[PDB]
Amino acid sequence: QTGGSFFEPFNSYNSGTWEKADGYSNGGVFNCTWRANNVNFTNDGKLKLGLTSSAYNKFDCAEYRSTNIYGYGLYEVSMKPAKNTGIVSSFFTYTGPAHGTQWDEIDIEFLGKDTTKVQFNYYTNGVGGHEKVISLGFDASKGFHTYAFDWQPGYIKWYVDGVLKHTATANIPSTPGKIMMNLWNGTGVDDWLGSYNGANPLYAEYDWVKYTSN
């Protein structure tokens, strides 16, 4: 029994809750370097992640993650992804070898090439391939909506504005992980994300995050 239920409205910063990625790159398909200066807190209480450029063809992106780890329960987020070919805005749980565990993760990803859809996925002991793309019936980039997943031992249920949209029923992840949010441009995955055209700055915003334990 790991982290407890919490509600994060992003109104002020206190130690022991979150951390910014800074100064290194995830490498691989991630074609940008994380910068702390790209994670900003607005005065009206939003977490704003930016994708910017320093110099020609050099991109800086952003990632914010919890310091504690959290297990089964309901994860909800009110967010507004960026819209642009070649990028991703996300909300996901994650644990892996860096944390000394197997790779388990549950994702909500908005492919910026088409923000009228959302991609749900998950990895269990490093096995992925569960991508499910759902049509939202609206352009998520235009305003805030609530996205959520209920993660229980026998299923993952994802919801959009409170409506059940997808249910996964096998090989569900079991290792508590950190809550993460990131915005990045890829390379090497044009088929998935579209080609990134260098447009910047781009922002994804998060108004709140809530986790309710069992």
Ligand SMILES: [Ca+2]
């Ligand atoms: Ca807020």
